[PDB]
């Protein structure tokens, strides 16, 4: 299982 | 005012703007480290000599930036900022950097295969040749440093052999895996010999730079460098506009430059930079 956690944008 | 300022940041959003249709499909779900970290997709890459048949085939979470702060007649650099390090899309990296005829890479990040591969290698080991979907990649040498290594690989196409091919990979070890470094140098070294790099090859392609999903680090690495030309292209004694900057780079590919932090590092490698690049003149 790739898990991971990060990402916002704009 | 609490609206005067709302109702200006406002004006700032553009992911409502920009569509990312692409990034969307549920096709290419595994090609995504981020759900919610999608390219636009007009500025964004397109997998070349694809399949449209197939649904996902010629898509890369990866986009075009470019320094609107410079002129088309100002030589001004091209990058690329992009996800990194994704096992999951290994094959596309090198079909994105061999169909962009990019020379040099940008990795700021470490490896980080945690149990499996967050962030997994691209390249093999020295004097070791590995092949990656149509293109065989080599390794001639990492000449590290003690913040940033630095990979010679030689790619071709299996096709072609005697069309070889030497791009550098700068990848940088020494950024806070969980903050940004507290000190520019490292860096502001990194990103003068990735300068005089490309600089060196006189027709090479963007600058693909990236990270885990290239955003906070990745869009932070392209604004420093990017206002290190509009200095070292304009001048010292020039108007700077760092939140002007990362605006206009945000408005290409949406994450770059995700933190507080990385918002700092930014007046601390230029406000560096400046009075070094002062000093070293002897600018009393």
Request: hydrophobic share 35%; with cysteine.
């Amino acid at each position: 299982e790739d898990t991971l956690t990060y990402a916002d944008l704009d | 005012g609490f609206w005067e300022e709302f109702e200006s940041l406002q004006k700032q959003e553009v992911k409502n703007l920009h569509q990312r249709l692409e990034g969307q499909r549920p096709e290419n779900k595994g090609k995504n480290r981020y759900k919610n970290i999608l390219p636009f997709d007009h500025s964004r890459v397109i997998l070349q000599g694809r399949d449209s048949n197939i649904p996902g085939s010629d898509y890369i979470n990866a986009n075009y930036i470019k320094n609107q702060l410079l002129g088309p007649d100002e030589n001004a650099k091209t990058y690329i900022a992009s996800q990194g390090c994704l096992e999951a899309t290994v094959n596309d990296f090198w079909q994105m950097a061999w169909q962009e005829n990019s020379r040099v890479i940008v990795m700021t990040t470490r490896e980080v295969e945690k149990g499996r591969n967050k962030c997994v290698p691209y390249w093999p080991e020295v004097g070791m040749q590995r092949a990656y979907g149509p293109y065989s990649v080599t390794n001639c040498g990492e000449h590290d440093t003690t913040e940033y290594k630095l990979r010679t690989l030689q790619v071709s196409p299996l096709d072609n052999g005697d069309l070889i091919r030497e791009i550098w990979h700068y990848q940088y070890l020494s950024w806070p895996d969980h903050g940004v470094p507290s000190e520019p140098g490292g860096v502001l070294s990194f990103l003068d010999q990735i300068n005089q790099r490309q600089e060196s090859l006189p027709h090479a392609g963007p600058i693909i730079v990236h990270s885990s999903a290239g955003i906070g680090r990745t869009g932070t690495i392209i604004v420093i460098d990017m206002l290190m030309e509009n200095i070292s292209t304009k001048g010292l004694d020039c108007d700077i506009d760092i939140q002007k900057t990362i605006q206009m780079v945000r408005a290409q590919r949406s994450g770059m430059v995700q933190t507080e932090a990385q918002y700092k590092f930014i007046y601390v490698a230029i406000a560096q930079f400046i009075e070094t690049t002062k000093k070293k003149l002897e600018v009393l």
